[PDB]
Amino acid sequence: AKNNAVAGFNALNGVELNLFTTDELKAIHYATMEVLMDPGIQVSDPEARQIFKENGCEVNEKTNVVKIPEYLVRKALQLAPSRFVLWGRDKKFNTVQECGGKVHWTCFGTGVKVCKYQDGKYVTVDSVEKDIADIAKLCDWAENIDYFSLPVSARDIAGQGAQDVHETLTPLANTAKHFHHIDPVGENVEYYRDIVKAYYGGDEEEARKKPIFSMLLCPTSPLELSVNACQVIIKGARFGIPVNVLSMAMSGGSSPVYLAGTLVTHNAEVLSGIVLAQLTVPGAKVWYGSSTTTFDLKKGTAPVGSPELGLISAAVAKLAQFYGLPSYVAGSXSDAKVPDDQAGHEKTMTTLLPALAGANTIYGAGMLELGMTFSMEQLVIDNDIFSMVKKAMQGIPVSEETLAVESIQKVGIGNNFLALKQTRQLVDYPSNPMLLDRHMFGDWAAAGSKDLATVAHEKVEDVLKNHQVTPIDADIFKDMQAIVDKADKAFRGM
Amino acid sequence: AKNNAVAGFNALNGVELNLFTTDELKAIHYATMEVLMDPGIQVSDPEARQIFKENGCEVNEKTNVVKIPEYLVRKALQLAPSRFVLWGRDKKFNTVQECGGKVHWTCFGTGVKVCKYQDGKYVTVDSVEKDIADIAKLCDWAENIDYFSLPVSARDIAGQGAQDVHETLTPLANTAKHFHHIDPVGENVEYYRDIVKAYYGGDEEEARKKPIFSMLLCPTSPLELSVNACQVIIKGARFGIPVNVLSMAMSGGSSPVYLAGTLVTHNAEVLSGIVLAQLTVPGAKVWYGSSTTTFDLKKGTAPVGSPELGLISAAVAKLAQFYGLPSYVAGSXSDAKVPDDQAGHEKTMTTLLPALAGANTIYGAGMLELGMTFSMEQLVIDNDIFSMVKKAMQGIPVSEETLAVESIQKVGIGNNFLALKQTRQLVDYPSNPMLLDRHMFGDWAAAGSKDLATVAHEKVEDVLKNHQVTPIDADIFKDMQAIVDKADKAFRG
Amino acid sequence: AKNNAVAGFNALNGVELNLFTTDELKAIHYATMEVLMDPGIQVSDPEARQIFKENGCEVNEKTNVVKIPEYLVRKALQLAPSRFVLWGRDKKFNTVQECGGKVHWTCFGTGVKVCKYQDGKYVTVDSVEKDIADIAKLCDWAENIDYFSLPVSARDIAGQGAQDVHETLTPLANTAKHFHHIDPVGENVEYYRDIVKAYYGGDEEEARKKPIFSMLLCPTSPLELSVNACQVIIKGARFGIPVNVLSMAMSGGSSPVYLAGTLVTHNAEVLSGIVLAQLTVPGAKVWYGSSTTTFDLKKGTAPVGSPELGLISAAVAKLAQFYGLPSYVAGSXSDAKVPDDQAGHEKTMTTLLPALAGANTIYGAGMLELGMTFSMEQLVIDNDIFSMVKKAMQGIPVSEETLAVESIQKVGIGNNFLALKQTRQLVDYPSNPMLLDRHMFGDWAAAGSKDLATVAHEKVEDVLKNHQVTPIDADIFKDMQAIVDKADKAFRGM
Amino acid sequence: AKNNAVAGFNALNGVELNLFTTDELKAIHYATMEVLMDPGIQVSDPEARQIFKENGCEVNEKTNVVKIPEYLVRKALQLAPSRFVLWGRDKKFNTVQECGGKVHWTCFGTGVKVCKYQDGKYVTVDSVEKDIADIAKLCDWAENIDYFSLPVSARDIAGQGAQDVHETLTPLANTAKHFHHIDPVGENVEYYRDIVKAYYGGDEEEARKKPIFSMLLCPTSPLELSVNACQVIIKGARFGIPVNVLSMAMSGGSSPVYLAGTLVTHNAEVLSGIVLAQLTVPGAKVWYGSSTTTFDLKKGTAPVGSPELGLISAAVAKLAQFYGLPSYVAGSXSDAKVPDDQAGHEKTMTTLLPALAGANTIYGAGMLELGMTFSMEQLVIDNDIFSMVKKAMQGIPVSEETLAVESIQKVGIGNNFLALKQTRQLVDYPSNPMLLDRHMFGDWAAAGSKDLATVAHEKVEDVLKNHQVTPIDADIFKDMQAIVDKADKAFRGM
Ligand code: NA
Ligand code: NA
Ligand code: NA
Ligand code: NA
């Protein structure tokens, strides 16, 4: 009869992308342990220095330099959890961050401009808190955007109050998905904590168990931890708020031209932050992240739509998998000023390498202009791209059924599979893009001979006009607004 | 002192892309050997059927179905060369096609329309032998295009002369790079042989030794070998011209919806061709090719800029490496009607996968509109994209030098590497795109706020107006031109 | 949201069992190649010797010793197909034999006695043609019995006609499954070809395309190919009949005591048979088979229900996979004289090793008494055993779905999965034995306190009395039956 | 000359069985860690909750639910010893339990009924303290039974005294092999400690250095730790008594139908016990154990002679080897009510998988009726089966010697190996079962046509009548018997 008994079989599910051998991973590690001991790392916050000192680090109090011994890096790595869950106000949006290759996406964060349509053209203008609400609504709709990362700055609130706290409630209000704050303020973490506690009716345990808010911080390249960064880490750990320690080194600028050497600088900085985190509160939820890229000597810019950004982010994901931590890297980025042929290429180049490598969170969707501008058109374009990427990540599934010899035989020479029952059952198996155009020249011309950007634009308009976002309870929202008012007051009363 | 003695070290040069385990490759293989025996393959050319029969295949002379035993597949694979060199008129354009991961690129082939600027916009018009000449010049300039593949059809010669023979001399004349004929005619292969024989001053040995010409043929899916195809294979092997057996199956159409099954249909078709080739002339140069894709039931078309094409082309390179043969697959393709955001995406999606997998030749550069139109703008864009893919393929080189600890220590905390000597020696190390814009908004606007398409268009212009292509010797050209005329004369008969 | 994107993932489907490293496989091989050149093999059939000589073998005509060079062994292996299909009269019984781990089972063959209940107990008596007809019917029912191998000898025909030809038509008439003749007679192969040709209305092409008959032969240990063995090979290749070159070596008797040495003897013998085949007709369907076992120096018998037999068969399956050929090995065998506790153990020991190893066909089902007797009871029992083995061969399928963390969480602490919808959907997922009793003492005693043996017996009766077999066309049969009568007359004509 | 210089050669000693890739193991791990945090584990004992809380666990005192952070699992796994020795009164019975593949067997534990021969037939009757003594004497004789595990309950002591304490001295007295108590009482652990201390004449150090006693506890599925379990873990750790954290989950009942999901449940449960142990006393000797099985909805029982049981037990060994701990799993089990064809099969099915997988201890020998009954016949039978399993585990040793080409060449074509000197020297190499019958029909019938069951019954009678057990020193036994009396006296006064 047809067999239904197969001895042990070796299989490959998806697509494997390799950049290192264990030997090489260790080489990078040793080099990092070497850097951590000399020069070491400049920890500007005194409270952080005391944490390091207490636990074994040598601390030069006049130069603020800390030398982290390898055993503390080991201890930290054994304390950090291998996974944690990001919650949304809508449980269906909960996103998992786990060591391994489960890839997820989030939008770029955080620009100072927005790419919008004025009088028959796309004009890049300064962003305002209002823009955040709109983008939050769009991302709430975009399926492939697992959670929300502060897209643009509420520049209009600058100097007027606690802008960072405004950048907390606006997002939480305009989307039910998890919120990741790219621009947190160390001294104001208590407000973020209070906002979330307010959402959960004053129940801090609830807030800790179902965190709807997390934050990011960047070590200062090369080899420094600013006062703000140290406080974000320490307060994140103590309040139970997921903290993303993301690097921002620059090859040929703040780190070696070579990528391996750059990863070393990145590794030293990120590990220092994670160590501080675990030393403050053992078991603190943390990300091993990066947006480190290459500096373009010949242009005077730090291109982030280049193959180097893709390779570096992919490498960082491999390093996080090597260390047992969840990763958060830059991807789906571009240096193009408009949603053109360039944006498409770069977005795909910088997203595919990190995705195939297994980055747990790839951020950059919707970004344009080397991380300066945010485009709603590019956001929906990128979202559709991730759908194509997820299909590719399916690789080739090999099984008696997928080989389908009987089908090939039933059809026979010179026929077609259109009528076949198996075929009609797999009607939804192939990739089905939302915006990408797969029509004959005719149908496309008759539709207006529109390009992707314009098609995307029409999509944005529809979403913003007809998408419903799960609103926060009328009363709870007031409790939350109260915290923002309190923050603005404290800010203005100097 | 500084170390200068390290024990055995395991390294990864480049970026490795894996899609199969050996057990899965075998499973696919068995499925194919199963299909080759039942239903088997329908060979239309009687000469080919005789070749197959003479060697052991069962040939039903009424249905024309040929059943190929597995031992013949093995014999064919033991005969086919693992590598061969493609020659251009200019030795500097020589390209190797070898089993493994050495990647190369070639333009698409062959469209019927051309996307060109008209009265303020890009208008897609039908192709002519003149268009071929222009593209050949553009590609002759594009560094990441190793050899030239027939881009568009010389439609203006249809029913007026031997179109295929015109499509042979025009390319050879307009570019010093090797030429790959996508639309050869079985009966006219001798014209081609002579064209080349002429180029080498009437020396056939030199033509065989330094082939500047090669052909492509497609088995008819599912499981068929048309008369034209068998003849291209037979004469190709007999004349010493590399033949590319490239599949054109369609998931949901001529092969199962599942990619694995599709790969089986493909494997059966391509191998049957390769078997014929080796049976004809043991040692004939051949390519394990593919442009197989999926059928969008929902859009009534066959998207070729999809993640599916990329996967298929990637898997075929792996099957090729598994069978010990050079590969030629679709890649750097798109379904967009214009060089927009969509084009850039699909071009990269379909090129990155086959490239990282190690496809020896990825073709599709310059193509748009599901393989209907060719675009010089997209072509130069693609060319720039390939430069970026090549940087990506460099991966992360790990060595004491690249780890650069001493540099990190010398620069120290809070400083920068700008003035570092090592940094200045590596000024050309980073990727440096030709078209892609890496400037800030200021400088970009100050340049007219141009998108990639226009920037590219301007490049096309500059190239077509100034690039110098090494021309064939006047005398020699007459000899070749003669064969074309002779062939056209015959056509009118 | 819930993840739906995973980077390359290494998986293990089923259970893998390993016995050798590539270095050890090669070691066995070199040993084999050395033995084939010295002392070589005694080919008693002059026609086969000729075939060998013509292709390059040194043949000593006065001793019949043929030394086979390694390049011929290589040539044969490259010529032999990696797979082929065994057809039944009922296409639904078709069975694939392919290099790899696709396992299948067939009954034992061929005994000279039958274990059956007489008057209050089991009595083992010599077999008769009628026994074959009943065992064929039984096996037609048993699902895990892919095809049918000549169970016992039609001993009552001895001395009256062509017993081997009777042994062909009876099986084919009593089951619609493919028939594997274990006692073919080199000289009568033409009769078998004709029976099958008759079944297909005189179409030899159809007979070659849909083989319902295949045969087995044994090299003579140590290192000999008898005339009968050579003729079965030569004619099978020439008539398009799948031939099983199966060894019957014996550790301590016809090969070294060590199992490696034994595999070397087995290897030389089996490969010589395969070479002959491919040299006779390139591409001839052949099996790499074995029923080689160890001799019990202490008991003066050849135990076939021992771990040694299980190990040998498993190793042979690995050697077959190593050489790229389908395997046919002894398994599910016992040395017990009755279907008892010993039976169950030995049957399981000797079937599990070869199954996990990946043997393409495991024969031995129904056998007892060291290969002398066939038991219908033990046959239905073995069939049930094969179901449990098929379940075990599933191993642990690891996927997000099978890990079911949500189910565990939804059910929570101190509760059960009985009402969970997922649970009721998998009502047929667990193993469900046909005979093995899983009832509480109460229900068991209430059913008669019957042991597996008698429960098995009751099943036999039921199947024999009610199972329906697809009959052969009355007229086609007549034509086949005629071939038998013809052979019987020629036989008597001495 | 003959070679005696061979470069690096890769070899395989034994039979390797594989079920998981490292990725799959990790996947089972993450799922388990996720479950240890939500829903977490219900620890009923208040002393245990304190132990957890003190070390960083979130403990909900109202629900008694403990959430174990991944860093504590890691810590416990780093503290637990990779190996430890089980002592017997006779140093020769000392059994090592070490992370890896060194397999050992022990009898089942613990039934409520015994399967014996009354008046012409086998009758299943309730057990008594005397039955423990007998079975202990039988297991003392069985060589493949490394140590003794409380086989049946001393029911005749129920309600009239400290049953468990009687179930301690009796075993120790009736066998000189290590004793594993399957049903220890948390509150009476001090009694066991004193009994052992008594054996070593008051030297508590010796008792700790040469443990002749160890115990087992079962987490309550799903996700629960009873007061008794916790006390066993804690006292065991503090007194220096090896503790076996053994799961008893059940697919489709207290855990998901899928095997993977069931493993997760098992993991969460067992690891919680191990964490408790290490936190109580770092370095405490423990086992990663299991007897988790499937539930047959179609039969209303939890079959333990199923392929599922074998798979689960084998998986638990692989997981243990992954975590670096010694394993103790169920195997050599059957659902049959009598020692018949079924018993033999299941026993082998469920012992071979874990054995080939490397379980450090497989318990179940002598058991019948889904874990309800203990059969001395099935015990000696199982013990013999293990001897066959041990031979199978030899796999194929490949060396110039075992390949024995010179031997093959010496004997030559068509000859015999019996007379060969090498063969005579290897007469004890082949498997030599004690009960399994390998005689030709004649000799067997002459011996009575006895099946394995009856043959076993005879060996039982012979052992029980003639086997000698090294007795405990008369004086020492007095002190020991005293503790038991003191325990009983205590039981009565309440
Ligand atoms: Na796959
Ligand atoms: Na590298
Ligand atoms: Na598995
Ligand atoms: Na071995």
Numbering used by the authors:
A (entry chain D), C (entry chain A), D (entry chain F): 2 to 495
B (entry chain C): 2 to 494
Can you list sentences taken from the study reporting this PDB entry?
The 22nd genetically encoded amino acid, pyrrolysine, plays a unique role in the key step in the growth of methanogens on mono-, di-, and tri-methylamines by activating the methyl group of these substrates for transfer to a corrinoid cofactor. A substrate:corrinoid methyltransferase catalyzes the demethylation of the specific methylamine, and subsequently transfers this methyl group onto an associated corrinoid protein. In summary, we have determined the structures of native MttB, and its complexes with a substrate analog, sulfite, and its physiological relevant corrinoid protein, MttC. These structures have provided new insights into the mechanism of activation of pyrrolysine that is distinct from the previously determined MtmB structure, and details of the key steps in the pyrrolysine-mediated transfer of methyl groups from methylamine substrates to the cobalamin cobalt in corrinoid proteins.
The 2.5 Å structure of MttB reveals that the protein exists as a D3-symmetric homo-hexamer, although based on the strong protein contacts between pairs of twofold related subunits, the structure is perhaps better considered a trimer-of-dimers. The dimer is further stabilized by interactions provided by an N-terminal β-strand (β2, residues 17–19). An α-helix (α3, residues 71–80) from this α/β subdomain interacts with the threefold related α helices on the other two dimers forming a triangle. A lone water appears to hydrogen bond the pyrroline imine and this water is in-turn stabilized by hydrogen bonding interactions with the hydroxyl group of Tyr364 and the main chain carbonyl of Gly110. One possibility is that Tyr364-Wat-Pyl334 form a proton shuttle that aids in the generation of the positively charged TMA-pyrrolysine adduct by formation of the tyrosine anion.
